[model samples]
Target chain A: ACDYTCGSNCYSSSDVSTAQAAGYKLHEDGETVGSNSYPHKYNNYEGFDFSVSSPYYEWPILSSGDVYSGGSPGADRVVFNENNQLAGVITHTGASGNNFVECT
Target chain B: ACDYTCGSNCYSSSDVSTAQAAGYKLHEDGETVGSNSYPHKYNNYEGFDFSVSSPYYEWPILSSGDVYSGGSPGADRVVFNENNQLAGVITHTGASGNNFVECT
Candidate 1:
């Protein structure tokens, strides 16, 4: 079941878990990918009351059904914590400028 | 966009809000429809960690685009809190007996 939607993109819980795992793995290894240096600190500027704790990191989660590597990171992202827990899934599709909105 | 799928039934966020509003209105008026006397107490025996506070109530949310009246109530339901907030959407399709599973 596709539980989350970011504009026209549809994502299942499996997709979320896969993206979270990959991002957390890179975070554990102190490494990053793509031009934006993914798995980077997310300041939670929007003040979303996420279930997970602070010190969250963001990583690209593509709708192309392919894992993210270097190059364009797209508009969507998977946010996670150092404890390897999912914080949220977000996108810039409907948001103004570079600000992200939570995927439903 | 369809945000929930229960067997062959698909529901959008709009459908959820509509169902919640109807059920909450009935609760406020001390009224109920259908055979099981909908908008009734849900004990939370399965103990799902819902975002909304309890005492929760369950009301039928039909896939056929018809509001429930007296008769068979089917399997799908919309659960809401005392504060008129959505707790969850569920169905008995995937579960044994009268037990339910949350719609995805």
Candidate 2:
């Protein structure tokens, strides 16, 4: 069973940990992969009440069970803080337009 | 478009509220429908960290889009506290044995 389900995708805690490591590395190096970039600053426009401190970044946690390298970084994202803490998972599936809604 | 999706089932916030109200009423009257005795005590054996106060109860929240009166109560349930606060929705869909997992 999925520890987190994003859209129709299933994800485990391992998946989250792996994604966080990669995304954090990119952020630390001040580098990027995809056109829109893999690890980018997440502006908390929706004002979600997260447990972690910010300077958060969003990175794709793909449905394919593969780490996101490039291309269209789907709607779902794994949010991590500067301390590399897992904030939460959010997705655009049920939200309007490009807005994100927390995935349970 | 479901706000909460269980295994092959869908639920909305309104649906949850409706179920909770009915369940709480049953509990208050010390009455129950179905053979399984719904609105019964939820032991919280899963050890979930719920925000609501305890002394929680579980009532059927069906996928058929109708309120449960009696007979086969499906796997999905809406859990609420004694104060009629919705704790969360849970389902046996993805769990081992008869244990439940939160719907999302």
Candidate 3:
């Protein structure tokens, strides 16, 4: 479910500041999961937020959100193995608090 | 679809000998992909060999068999990126040959 790359601009990473600055919220356990989206760079692009319209899922829902491991980039994240070349985004934790994610 | 961990022992790697010794065949393009299952180490473990039933898909069929670029282990293969630690199996190429994979 980790799509590694959402094309261009919509990168997923551990930078909480980046997420917040780019229009995303952080949630903790039992919080509403998957109900936000970052503005996609290209008109044809689609943004990923966690999914709330579940079977009742949770945060970082596999192919959504920019949830990541904090303290550094690529520390705990999803990276693209673009044929051995590190292409696109690598989602990880951020300096902010960690949240419980749900993916359906 | 890339389940990363198929439990234990049922490691998906690019080591062709390991796969062959363990009992997996190499298929070329447009093969009758996915029709085998490796002998599970544990009774609970269900070894993947690729799917053959249609949707008449092709090699590797997502959650089936070990197929690759056919050169070296981990050379053109998958490696575990287990939670900041290398875990599970990373399927890739081997010495024998390369085959086009299909995952439905």
Estimate every model's Cα lDDT from 0 to 1: 0.81, 0.80, 0.24
| Worst 10 contiguous positions by lDDT, candidate 2 chain B | B79-88
* Lowest-sum lDDT 10-residue window in model 2 chain A: A66-75
Cα lDDT for residue A103, candidate 2:
83
Candidate 2 TM-score, true structure as reference: 0.50
Chain A (alone) TM-scores for all candidate structures:
0.96, 0.93, 0.18
Worst 10 residues of 1 chain B by lDDT: B65-74
**Per-residue lDDT of B92 in model 3:** 27
The count of backbone overlaps in candidate 3 is 23
RMSD of each: 16.5, 17.2, 16.7
Q: Please write out the lDDT profile of model 3 over residues B1-104, one tens digit for every residue.
A: 22334222133333423443222233212222211221111111223342222111111212225443221111122211112122123232211122211111
- Tens digits of per-residue lDDT for model 1, A52-85: 5656788999998777877798999998764445
Docking class of 2: incorrect
lDDT of 2 by residue, B1-104 (tens): 68888798978878876887687778756699988898788989998777755667889988887888997888999887654456789999989997999988
Clashing pairs in 1: none
- True lDDT of residue A77, candidate 1: 93
Q: Would candidate 3 be rated incorrect, acceptable, medium or high by CAPRI criteria? A: incorrect
Q: Which regions in candidate 1 have their CA more than 4 angstroms from the true location? A: B1-104
